[PDB]
């Protein structure tokens, strides 16, 4: 759904250009997360948010260093949110579908 | 007595209720559907619809129906047949879908994998009603 | 010429794969598979790890070849370390696999240095007592799918339980043609299995087949004075892209995509040469391959139609047009003879001898025997001996009625008869309806 | 090194039989099929080929006389043992009974036991078992020929 | 005398036929069976698989991890353990007869828990606080005949070897008539209980009805794969005798699977080995190399396995497969043979989880010849046209011929048509089937891609796709010639 | 079926040859090795009782099976067909190759009680 990914990318952060690139990422990363990363009924309510934050780091490292993002938008405990997002990065930010998504 | 001396006087009426709750797995389809994610719920809905229209259906025909529904509706991204089968076994692990192995009754009768459902329709449709992105599959 | 005889015998040995083990030919597109098998075997025979793995590929896709090559390679350096139990799913049943394992265990342990004696219960108990440094037992189990039946997979359960929980090192190599072999397995059997499935490589592109032909036909040892000239001739033919070998290899790649199919034609090309010049002329022209392909198609529908007599052709044409006019395609001897006599009268009215009904019976039986007609709704050859036995203890209704009322269906139709009967044949206008 | 006889209209077939059938087991296929309809000279060409090469050891079986698979297995065991007894009469042998073959596995065991007592021979030889009319078996199924295809892989390789 | 048929391979065991009811002349004539030299358990094959080790094998940095993650080597099962142990201990100490029903999915620790219970019970009996008992293990899938359990259990009790019927009345006499003071308690593990289910259901009734006898002192621990087995397959008598109490072994959560894998990786993870750079052999404490397997990789594998099955066998095998992928890459890089930090990364775990998911069927259909792809294309065209799941082979022949003769102007069809119908040769007449038609038909039948019915007329015989239609479509339009037309 | 006809025929043959004077396979190879097991020639007379009730495809295939024993010099075979309908009735329920086979040496004889009164 476009509204959930749009709201999640929005409140992780702070049209159809770079925020559109970010939305497209969160969606692909979330869809492959649904298949290869399994969460219980609590952690599942932040599957979009965590995925959104991952895409944010990619922007901060690839094209725009000036982009800002903060962690506590994730509706879990910040230690638990940290552990889950490290798990998500290390697992499927190097996945073969998520390698030719042009970030420019 | 087993539960009374595993959890530690005249024993109470509550231990009888504890016996009748411990050895009756009163699992609800409410609790089973609520432990799934959106993709397992979607594949459960497509399985239900394929068995509604065919009722002697294989894994592969249900995957064909899932592909047709997911290209008609365009929700997330379509899955490959083995990922579909893995989510079907996940639904076995949850206890909503069973995959058996049975003979066909056509002109070419061989053994195939078959989907049966052991869940009741009313609370299934009630749980799937509350999700807006699933009602094209109901 | 003993030199040409030595060259011919070496070429035939390379084509049959019967070279010594240090000279055996592994195709380029086959290293990545065989190294993987070379790992698993060497992790079991040498390092005493228990493994179970299924090879999946079509028939004649070098499963047995690579496995036999691996076992013969490990035989020459680690001979006392392992024994081999070979089972075949066609030959061994669920009961006789136990006796096969026991007999092979006894005869292999008497070869390295009883279980086999008694009833089947005692034999199975002695096997499980034996199998539940150490000697690695290597199971080569061809046709894994026949023992992966839906009723009860007892042997697969016991063998994968041996791989998992026994302290005897066991290697199991199943082999099958079935692509979805993992879905054949029962839940406990599938759980005990490692779920390691190796899919055999296919030919992907044309110069894989060209390089495999080059590896098959290049003599890499100096055993004949004709070796260098043969190698130059073969390289000249295989490098020229308009040569007859490259045309036949391309044809195989686009139709069969099978190197055993190519070898079955290349072997009598080599073996029918009398001298070296005849062999070079044969490998340039490839004229024998066309004669081979003509002979491999000599007994299909077209050649059997060309072997027919004029009355046989007339009866077949009449049966074909009666079958075309029918709804279910069914016909008998009476309607076919009526069509035949109308056709002969309409020919002679515009002189062909009209044969009597008592003589067309022999032609009809010859046409049934030559697989031109089949009995209506006939199963034919059954899949297994049990269904064949059940069919043999039953008398079908077709064999109790007279022969002129038996319903038949056509193996060839009137359009194909019109296509492959020549224009100048005088029964041709009867191929249209 | 084989003699190609003259058959009047089966010259290609006789050349192919010279290509495939030889005394050397390395350059001989494990299975060879001659396919043709009735009265096409299959038996005639095979007899003229084997008569012109007397050093080739052939055993002839007619499956039409055996009718079922179990007498075919027993006939294979009996005829192979009798031919190997006639061929090398100065080799002492245990006489295994043909009637104890009731499974293809038992045929594999009996052929193993028969062939393991001829290792005193100096050269590798071929034994050509000719099943003249395999599909003329009366009780034929689709699974029988597969066992005969895969039979050679259960026998020893250095025999 | 001439026989009508012969049985020349009869193998009969040396089993007597007289049951235990006729050993002694009276009930009082039976001695205390615990003092008999043959009763109650009172191998010769282990040396047959010994050889001489004349080599020195190399065990690398990941060798100890792969050897230690095997199923041969009880954290998450402590309530089930307590339930089984307390029921069996109360049944032993009071001299009672009791059925304990345990059910569950594969690999959730049922056999392991029951075996740990009987080891603690035997240790407790060794300290003389409960009376001594005999432990019998009967696996239904390890029997040739289902009645052989009658053969097994009685042979474990008396040491005699009888046929199954005489063993059955021997066990009935022993459990009912012999008094408690002359007997010993027997704990029987019936494992794979469904494998011992027959049409008569006599074995089920006998084994659970002996637990209702006053003198029996029999404890039957039955392991099932489902909890609804006595209602679905067994009668009301056997269901009543099994009882209302039924212990279910749930699938492991990912915390429990992670605890199991971390319990096997204690002493090896975050440790140092001495590694030879010349051969590759590594010794637990020349270079000092630290071995790690990351906890994120274990938690990913545990979460995936817990959602799919909750199976400890699959979690251990996925971890071992990841370590083997890492160790294969290690031997490829350093050139080691089979005679500062090494890590099993998360990428190896993802590769191990994806190698059973990658759908080789599409790849197999992509790497086929043109004739097989043309057959599949024609069959798919017929399913699109007339909407049937089964198509006659003559229709496939006719539509292949139509596909060749309509799009002739394609350059590939002008190249291939003489090959398809004459094998590129004059003096070969035009063929009714294509070249290699039966070859590709039998090849697709061998793979399980196709189903063919059993008819002797080759034209009216039906062919059905056994695989899904969408994967056949994507394999077909991967091909550049077939997607062009 | 043909298999039962051959099995009963070979069992009767072995029983008679043992009664007239190790076990064997009840197939036609017993006819092949008859001189090696009993030292005498073989004359087989087949009495087909009630041919108007037998399955004609099975009888045809049994006659084709019995044709295979003609390559043995020690064997001669007689066939007796007990007919109550007509010769042409059995002539049109057999294949023409079998009719050509039976035509080489055949005789007819009337058996019925109204033979010349
Ligand atoms: N031991 C061997 N030595 C030499 N050549 C062999 C050997 N085994 C097989 N071949 C050849 O290798 C080729 C491939 O056939 P192979 O027997 O390996 O098939 P396969 O893949 O095991 O198939 P199937 O599933 O039918 O068993 C054939 O040409 C065969 O003759
Ligand atoms: N090329 C030939 N030259 C001479 N005579 C021949 C030739 N071919 C066949 N014959 C004769 O025809 C007879 C029939 O041939 P043969 O028995 O070999 O046929 P077949 O194909 O084996 O038949 P079937 O399958 O019916 O047994 C031979 O016995 C022989 O007399
Ligand atoms: N709690 C556990 N702690 C450690 N290892 C365990 C545990 N549970 C299972 N395992 C491992 O899994 C293996 C398989 O478990 P087990 O044989 O008990 O399964 P099961 O539930 O009886 O399965 P099946 O139904 O297939 O027989 C054990 O041998 C052990 O290696
Ligand atoms: Mg093979
Ligand atoms: Mg012949
Ligand atoms: Mg178990």
Please, could you describe this protein's structure?
Chain D: ATP binds at residues 36-43. Chain D: This is Origin recognition complex subunit 5. Chain D: Its main location: nucleus. This is part of a larger assembly, with chains A (104 residues), B (138 residues), C (433 residues), D (159 residues), E (485 residues) and F (117 residues). Chain A is built from 4 helices and no strands. Chain A is an all-alpha fold and 104 residues long. The longest helix of chain A is centred in the N-terminal third of the chain and has 19 residues, at 18-36. Chain B contains 7 helices and 2 strands; from the N terminus they run H-H-H-H-H-H-E-E-H. Chain B has a two-stranded antiparallel sheet. The longest helix of chain B has 16 residues, at 38-53. The N and C termini of chain B lie far apart (48 Å). Helices cover 52% and strands 8% of the residues of chain C. In chain C, helix 11 (259-271) crosses helix 13 and helix 15 (310-325) crosses helix 17 (357-369). Chain F has 117 residues and is α+β, with helices and mostly antiparallel strands. Helix content of chain F is 44%, strand content 12%. The termini of chain F are far apart. Classes of the chains: A mainly alpha (104), B mainly alpha (138), C alpha/beta (433), D mainly alpha (159), E alpha/beta (485), F alpha+beta (117). The interface between B and E is medium-sized, with 24 and 35 residues. The structure holds adenosine-5'-triphosphate (3 copies) and magnesium ion (MG) (3 copies).
The number of strands of chain A is 0
Helix share, percent of chain E: 40-55%
Major beta sheet of chain E, specifics?
5 strands, parallel
- Pattern of helices and strands of chain A: HHHH
Estimate the global geometry of chain E from the Cα principal axes.
extended
The assigned structural class of chain A equals mainly alpha
Structural class of chain E: alpha/beta
Distance between the termini of chain E: 76 Å
Kindly report the greatest chain-chain contact and the residue count on each side: C-E, 98 and 83 residues
Q: Any ligands, ions or cofactors bound here, and which?
A: adenosine-5'-triphosphate, magnesium ion
Record field, number of beta strands of chain E: 12
Number of helices of chain E: 19
GO molecular function, one term (chain C): DNA replication origin binding
Organism (chain C): Saccharomyces cerevisiae (strain ATCC 204508 / S288c) (Baker's yeast)
Function (chain C): Component of the origin recognition complex (ORC) that binds origins of replication. It has a role in both chromosomal replication and mating type transcriptional silencing. Binds to the ARS consensus sequence (ACS) of origins of replication.
Keywords (chain C): DNA replication, DNA-binding, Nucleus, Phosphoprotein
